[PDB]
């Protein structure tokens with residue numbers, strides 16, 4: 001297992017524009033198009049991202065290309081962020097994947113708002129981090145995915161993604 005397989009499990013794959021758990025227009029493997037209520041604005045963003053007249057449908061290779069770009073961007077976003085990089089550097093490879101997952105889902109700004117939990121991760125207090133992480137809108141809104149990520153931070157293994 002690795003970050004790509006992990007996020008593919010958490011986000012799924014859909015080739016036509018859909019609404020994500022928050023109601024925002026999305027396509028592919030969790031690629032947010034816009035927060036705008038307008039389906040046309042979303043179609044516009046899509047064509048702009050793919051570089052062709054898509055009419056809201058994309059192929060599997062287009063979806064995986066957006067996905068490669070988005071993982072790359074999440075990683076570099078962590079490494080340029082002053083709050084996040086020190087945490088990332090302190091973690092082992094499995095736990096780094098959990099941090100990337102969170103950034104991918106909620107963005108740098110969003111994750112940097114978990115200041116108390118991140119300090120606990122840096123200190124390597126895994127059980128205490130896991131409790132703090134669950135006291136969050138994130139956990140209440142997408143509990144099954146949040147449990148998988150939290151379990152990854154607590155154990156440093158892929159067991160939550162095992163047989164999925």
Ligand SMILES: *SCC1=CC(C)(C)N(O)C1(C)C
Nearest residue numbers: 082083084086112115118119
């Ligand atoms: S969220 C900012 C932050 C606080 C502290 C726990 C000292 N950190 O290590 C970072 C920069 C993550």
